[PDB]
Every structure is written in structure tokens, then in C-alpha cells.
């Protein structure tokens, strides 16, 4: 158990050139153990860091000696970490006579158990299909919603960076939604009679597991390098697209590691041969946290995609559609222009083999929680995250292609 006692997460917000240079440099000098929560970008845009307690006095230090503005944006990560495993304990112990409450983090066994009751109890819609194994031999499963027939597919995944938790949860939210509705909601047996949904809620296993037993801030896979004594790649960094280019890191031991080549990672390689072998997978969508962005490619250049005017006009619905719930805002757009650049991402490989309908969510909140996202905010996050994936699949249902 990795604790972070004392540990501070900061809000900086560079003005210049240089200040930027400098926090990069901060982000690339691996030995100063700093977590960037959110990289820096360009001028003016805000950077969040989680310095370890013995380092916070020497950053700040630093920070003031450049003249880099900054706040205290979380005084202590562990009381946030603490609280998390007491709602979670809590909560394991009611599941223990009482049902499965989708409002709450679950441990890996416990998500696969509901993912087979569901399978179990709707067997005429839902089936589990296995696609590989992760590094450490867990398995990939993928639940497959359909009516029958060969249909072409919508494909949805949760879970590629460990420490995203609310994506695990709301993955599997929505896997029971769409149960839920199927055949009493008119637009969602309308989508299910013309495509097929492919959900994958668990896309790093491996990572997931260690983020619960040992350490909370893990973010990648956990495979072994060949002459490296660090572990893990960043699987958002690994795929073929602009590999190995500006927007991810060559070293091993970087949280940004894009790993010894492209779809070096299981993980990866499971994804992109299932999608090559089914052949008519048209929208891919893929969960993240935090930063509340909805984004299309592309992340390794920043000039505008083919379908640029098309793909914002179906982003900005989405947007507006998950707004309306509660009043959540969602910064809309490529990713180069709402981030940054960014190499090996997936939705970029997506769009390149073909699939048009590529995007990327990022979901709440803003800095306050960061990736320690209380319990509680799961069901509104999964509520309003729904009507902006609904107003995407009813585009693709009405756009064929
Ligand atoms: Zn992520």
C-alpha cells in the first residue's frame, strides 16, 4: 500500500513560452516524482501536479524562484484516499446481503460477477466475448449487445488508464441501462435493431488491480521491459498512429511511455484485432477522466480531419444533450486544439483505419477531485455522460457509411 500522506496536488497556470518549457522539463525529469493530473499545454492554460510531501517545499520553491503563478488545489490526497476506501468498505459490506449498487467502486471480480449476472439474466440481447488476455493472463471480456443478424457495430471502452475509476463505473452503469430501456425506450431499440454495441469496461485489468492493492496513482499496463527494472506502458500511447512521435515519452519509467513499438501492449493488440477481424465496426468511443472534454482526432497532428464540420456538429449535440441533466460543461473539439499534441492515441487510429465516428470523453471533474472522484458523483456522471452517447449512436444509426 503506496500512501500520500501530505501530498499536495497544485494548480499552475504558466503565461509564456517559457514557463512551459520549464514545467516540462519538471514532467520529463522523472527522478523528482511529481504526478502531472493534467500536463501543461499552452500559455494561459492550467496545469495540475501531485507533488509527494517531502518534495512539496522544494517545488514550490522553484515555482516562485520562475515566477510561475500557482494554488493549492488538494492540501491532502491521502484524506481524499481515505474517505474513497471507507465508502467503498461500506458499501462492500451492504452488497453482502443486499443488491449490487452501481453508485459505488467495485473491485475487478466483483465487475466481472455482475457482468455474467447480466449476461445470465437478459441471455436473448446480452453475450460475453472474449478477445485475449491482458499481460498478466486476465481476460479480455467484451459484453456484445445485440438483436441478431450481421450488423455493423458500435464499439465502447472504459478503463485503458488504471486510475480512471468513474469510467469502470460508468461502463457498467451503462451496460445495465441499456437492458434497462431496451424495448421500452424508442430510440435505444431503434439503435439495437440496426447496430450491435460492443462494451468493454475493463480495458487495463492488470493496472486496475494494482491501482487497488498497491498504488492508486497507477496509469498504465503493467508489462515487463526487456532490460528495464520499470514497468508498464501507456496504452493510450501505443497504438499505430503517429507512433512513437511528439506527445509521448521514450522512457520507460515515464508515466507517457509509449512502450518498444506500436501495439507492443496485449491490451492493445486484442482491441485492434478484434475490430480488424469483425470488419463493420462504425462509431468508436472511448471513456476517460478527468477534464469534462468530448473530443475527435486528431491528437498526433493538428491539422482539421476530413469530417471535421460534421464531427464538431455531432460533438457539440452530445455536449449539449449531456448538459441538460445538470448543467455540466464540456469543452468540444480535436484533440490537438483541446489538449495538445499527443501521439499513439486510439480514437486517432480509429479514424485512420476507417471509423469515422471516433471519439474521446474525458469525464468529471475539473481539478477539485481529480481522479479521486467521490462515490456519490458516479450516478449523475453515468446520468448525463448517457444522454451525450445517446445523441452519438442515434447519428450513427441515421448515418450509414
Ligand atoms: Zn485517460
Same mark, same amino acid.
Given at each position: 500500500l503506496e500512501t500520500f500522506v501530505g501530498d499536495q496536488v497544485l494548480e499552475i497556470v504558466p503565461s509564456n513560452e517559457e514557463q512551459i518549457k520549464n514545467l516540462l522539463q519538471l514532467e520529463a525529469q522523472e527522478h523528482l516524482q511529481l504526478d502531472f493530473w493534467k500536463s501543461p499545454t499552452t500559455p494561459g492554460e492550467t496545469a495540475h501536479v501531485r507533488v509527494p510531501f517531502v518534495n512539496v517545499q522544494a517545488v514550490k520553491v522553484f515555482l516562485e524562484s520562475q515566477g510561475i503563478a500557482y494554488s493549492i488545489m488538494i492540501e491532502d490526497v491521502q484524506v481524499l484516499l481515505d474517505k474513497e476506501?471507507?465508502?467503498? /468498505?461500506?458499501?462492500?459490506?451492504?452488497? *453482502?446481503?443486499?443488491?449490487?449498487?452501481?453508485? !459505488?467502486?467495485? &473491485?475487478?471480480?466483483? %465487475?466481472?460477477?455482475?457482468?455474467?449476472?447480466?449476461?445470465?439474466?437478459?441471455?436473448?440481447?446480452?453475450?460475453?466475448?472474449?478477445?485475449?488476455?491482458?499481460?498478466?493472463?486476465?481476460?479480455?471480456?467484451?459484453?456484445?449487445?445485440?438483436?441478431?443478424?450481421?450488423?455493423?457495430?458500435?464499439? /465502447?471502452?472504459?478503463?485503458?488508464?488504471? *486510475?480512471?475509476?468513474?469510467?469502470?463505473?460508468? !461502463?457498467?452503469? &451503462?451496460?445495465?441501462? %441499456?437492458?434497462?430501456?431496451?424495448?421500452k425506450d424508442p430510440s435505444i431499440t431503434s439503435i439495437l435493431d440496426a447496430l450491435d454495441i460492443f462494451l468493454l469496461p475493463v480495458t487495463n485489468p492488470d493496472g486496475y488491480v494494482f491501482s487497488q492493492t498497491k498504488n492508486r496513482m497507477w496509469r498504465k499496463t503493467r508489462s515487463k521491459v526487456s532490460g528495464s527494472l520499470c514497468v508498464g506502458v501507456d496504452p493510450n500511447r501505443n497504438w499505430d498512429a503517429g507512433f512513437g512521435g511528439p506527445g509521448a515519452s521514450s522512457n520507460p519509467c515515464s508515466d507517457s511511455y509509449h512502450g518498444p513499438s506500436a501495439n507492443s501492449e496485449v491490451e492493445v493488440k486484442s482491441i485492434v484485432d478484434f475490430i480488424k477481424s469483425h470488419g463493420k465496426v462504425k462509431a468508436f468511443i472511448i471513456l476517460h477522466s478527468y477534464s469534462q472534454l468530448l473530443m475527435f482526432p486528431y491528437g498526433y497532428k493538428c491539422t482539421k480531419l476530413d469530417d471535421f464540420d460534421e464531427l464538431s456538429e455531432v460533438a457539440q449535440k452530445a455536449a449539449q444533450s449531456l448538459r441538460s441533466l445538470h448543467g455540466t460543461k464540456y469543452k468540444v473539439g480535436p484533440i490537438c486544439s483541446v489538449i495538445y499534441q499527443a501521439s499513439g492515441g486510439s480514437?486517432?487510429?480509429?479514424?485512420?483505419?476507417?471509423?469515422?465516428?471516433?471519439?474521446?470523453?474525458?469525464?468529471?471533474?475539473?481539478?477539485?477531485?481529480?481522479?479521486?472522484?467521490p462515490a456519490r458523483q458516479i450516478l449523475p456522471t453515468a446520468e448525463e455522460t448517457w444522454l451525450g452517447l445517446k445523441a452519438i449512436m442515434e447519428h450513427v444509426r441515421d448515418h450509414p457509411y
Open positions: 476506501n471507507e465508502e467503498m /468498505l461500506f458499501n462492500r459490506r451492504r452488497e *453482502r446481503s443486499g443488491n449490487f449498487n452501481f453508485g !459505488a467502486y467495485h &473491485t475487478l471480480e466483483e %465487475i466481472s460477477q455482475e457482468m455474467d449476472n447480466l449476461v445470465a439474466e437478459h441471455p436473448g440481447l446480452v453475450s460475453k466475448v472474449n478477445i485475449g488476455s491482458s499481460f498478466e493472463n486476465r481476460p479480455m471480456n467484451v459484453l456484445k449487445f445485440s438483436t441478431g443478424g450481421d450488423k455493423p457495430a458500435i464499439w /465502447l471502452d472504459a478503463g485503458i488508464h488504471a *486510475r480512471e475509476w468513474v469510467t469502470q463505473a460508468t !461502463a457498467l452503469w &451503462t451496460a445495465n441501462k %441499456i437492458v434497462s430501456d431496451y424495448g480514437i486517432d487510429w480509429s479514424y485512420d483505419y476507417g471509423i469515422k465516428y471516433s471519439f474521446a470523453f474525458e469525464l468529471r471533474d475539473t481539478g477539485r477531485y481529480g481522479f479521486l472522484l
